[PDB]
Symmetry: C3
Subunit: 367 residues, 3 copies
Amino acid sequence: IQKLNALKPDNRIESEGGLIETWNPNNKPFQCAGVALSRCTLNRNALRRPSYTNGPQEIYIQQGKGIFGMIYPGCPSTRHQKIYNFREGDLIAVPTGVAWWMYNNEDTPVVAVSIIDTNSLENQLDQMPRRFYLAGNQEQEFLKYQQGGSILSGFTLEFLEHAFSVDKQIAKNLQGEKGAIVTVKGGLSVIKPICTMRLRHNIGQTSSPDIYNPQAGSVTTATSLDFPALSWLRLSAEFGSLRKNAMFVPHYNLNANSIIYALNGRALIQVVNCNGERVFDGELQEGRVLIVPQNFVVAARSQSDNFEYVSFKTNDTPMIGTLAGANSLLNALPEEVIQHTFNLKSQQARQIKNNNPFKFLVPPQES
Amino acid sequence: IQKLNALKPDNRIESEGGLIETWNPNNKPFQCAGVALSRCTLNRNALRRPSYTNGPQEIYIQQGKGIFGMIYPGCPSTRHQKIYNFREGDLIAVPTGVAWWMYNNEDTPVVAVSIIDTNSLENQLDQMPRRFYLAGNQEQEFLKYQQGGSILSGFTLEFLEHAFSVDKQIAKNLQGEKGAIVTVKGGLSVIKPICTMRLRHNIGQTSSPDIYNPQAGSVTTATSLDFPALSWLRLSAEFGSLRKNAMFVPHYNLNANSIIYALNGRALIQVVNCNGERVFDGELQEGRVLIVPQNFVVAARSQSDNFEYVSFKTNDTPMIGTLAGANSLLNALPEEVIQHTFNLKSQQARQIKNNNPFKFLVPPQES
Amino acid sequence: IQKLNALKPDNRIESEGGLIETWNPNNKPFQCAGVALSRCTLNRNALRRPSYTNGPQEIYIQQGKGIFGMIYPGCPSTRHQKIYNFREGDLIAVPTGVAWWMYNNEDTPVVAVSIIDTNSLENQLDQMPRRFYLAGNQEQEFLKYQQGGSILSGFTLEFLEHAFSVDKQIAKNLQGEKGAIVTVKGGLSVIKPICTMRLRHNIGQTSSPDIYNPQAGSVTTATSLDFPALSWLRLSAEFGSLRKNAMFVPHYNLNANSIIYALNGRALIQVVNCNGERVFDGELQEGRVLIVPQNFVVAARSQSDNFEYVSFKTNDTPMIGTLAGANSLLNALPEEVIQHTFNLKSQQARQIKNNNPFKFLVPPQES
């Protein structure tokens, strides 16, 4: 790739109580990353209908409070299986093929941006995304990219009558006859709170930052160490809040692919490749995404009082190699290999290893 | 997949003591599937000569009894390494690159239908199925599909001469100069009985079933839980025997592809995809196979008194989501969300949950 | 593959303090094996500047003595992380992404040959070899195949300024303002003795060999049982020394590709495929590389006094299946079945089983 561009969605699907936005998974960034991105927003009383995908999915909630519930095959009911609550900041984990449903109850919408790792090992189909809905007669979000009905409507009435042991009339209602997101007139009176596994860990409205710098921002990461349902996914996530003109240092992921989606405000990012080319040099704003491939190096300087972002890294234990600051790779170098690979005096080399005391987040220059 | 079809073979190879038939790997079903199917039948006194593929193999024995022996490199002998017996319903696990031979001695022929997963992490070559014979001049079963002799008959007359430490004459014998299934005139007088790992497990008719229902039939599953050599393969198999007009309810496999080879009888099968499209609506009869991709939904009604099948799943521990039955996905949903995704009333949603009290097999409708 | 051949390199770069050669990764043999070979060389007082790749690397030192550093991300300093010394006959293991530098102080020019497994599961990018130089203005070894400056020079002056917290005078030095391998004029004052695990193991002649035949030679191999860091790499290596006219028997790797680099001398190798076609017959001589795929079979007779080779296998625990020897597959086959596959008398079967008593190495034929 010669030029990474900030990408917008190219597909909106307005449902009765919501909206689904999907990004084109065949632009070379998304081809390379091997994920498909989606932003679902569901209004008051909306109930996203039960569905599943042929790959690992990890959902980040940008705003809202609802209930969500996953129908796991080998699992015990309570009537019905476990319903979890959520808040903005929560990272939801969805194992391959597991069917889920989500519902909102307040005025403030649920906006939940999320990625499908189409390129996962668990995805024994092809690199195309697919959602398999259990209900309704509607085009699945990604059918456009391939080139409607639920997985139950593609059956024969005689087959559905026999399977459920119900009469023809009710069997007709299963068989199709509002989109994926439906509005509940009366609102669900369904109780507000591996089958044992926690699949909800908050990296937004926390107060326990991985890194926290009162002069520059704060950053948090959910890896499997602290959110073990993520070893199932082999997926990760980072949330970082950045003050105006603070910066996160040049770094690269050794073992992963970052899909940086910007939640708030804006920042000027720079990403340079193996040949030293500056494959993107611009600004990333709200509701826009930048994919940063594996060993490529990104550096950002903020433009807003708090430029927030969720970076979905594809690896449940991602590793970053900081190139400037407290724990950098140049710090860990002998003071004389730096002198000869950079062509620096002994005096200077020291400054390049100690002028910035800060780990990852470096404060605003002050001018 | 546009349309799935009940595939038969496109390759008969008749040898002295038996027959090998293979199914085309370049068909779109097998290409998605990632498998290579084949069915070898050995007659009385026949010896399938030692060979090996570059991927995980899983052999099911449709009928007959005989013996088979692995030639595992890191092992102790006795004279010779271990030879095992086999009955019908035996599932033999063969690790990547291990060699083996199989012999029959009855009048009843061994019919062993098997799959090589050519899309394995273990297969480090290409998607093309191939078999490497130690002995005998003959072309390999999948030479047909690429576009001969065995591996030993390719070296120089003096390289075997030098290697085995023998003369020109028996070097010419080892050097090639009846195909893969030769008949052993008198009979192999070898006694009828990881190195220690049990590569045999009976899933067939002489088993203790997983689902059993005397009005509808029974299912039996060999995951890696119960047959531990299968976690080496990363392959599974399943046996079913449905009563006439009994059905297995619509279900999908969360994490595996299935290759349903029908062993006995006939059945009316139906599979639907992500867009509610009925990709197969027909009959799978004996000696035919139907590939059901990853999150595709499958349901079948039996048309025989006892329709029997083998289902090679491609995952050593497959999970199936049942869409109807005691433990269905719909059974674990809140009654109220079942009303709102399918447009039912409370009463009807009491029925989709409770009209069928059965797990996986549902009895004949009984009219 | 139709035919194989002994390959010499196509690309060579003269750097100030040494040289770098790279084999073309887009040959059909290299696309099949899935690896990229480079042979670098450090003359005296040379530093190889910090670099890193999107894949698991395994460097084998052919000749010389020197030291090297590995800049691991999480790892603790000492002033800087822990340095290791290498001497010839060594194998150094470099995890995906880890940056490393390499120095030479003797006159004796360090020659190391190495692979990058671009087909790894850690390699999330594509099938391209690509080195990320941490400093200096030079075009990367592999760029040519793709068709410069470092990851630091592509960045902006003020981004580098603010990043490192420096003055603009040393930020411009730092911004790249003598190639990969640069001569330290005085030569480093730096000493000569997962953050603590061993990443060096010696498989040269100094080592205790696995096989030692005083008339034939010796074979030493490092798996992840004896060099555990290689389980990270999912790679291994194997050194071989063979007297004139001796032979390593016909054999096949069950689970790995093989990259034979001819260190010293010249032998005559034969590799035959699954059809019986001798896809290579002729001589692999010094500084040349023969790729030998997964279940393909190889035999070789040494034509020099002591032909020396390193075999880069693509598996940390490769299993080999030898075709003639003490330990052979034929040995484990009952005398009777080996009579019938090869068409031999009983007494001619015992000759195959017993004449050659040596494991892997068979002496000269004695003429």
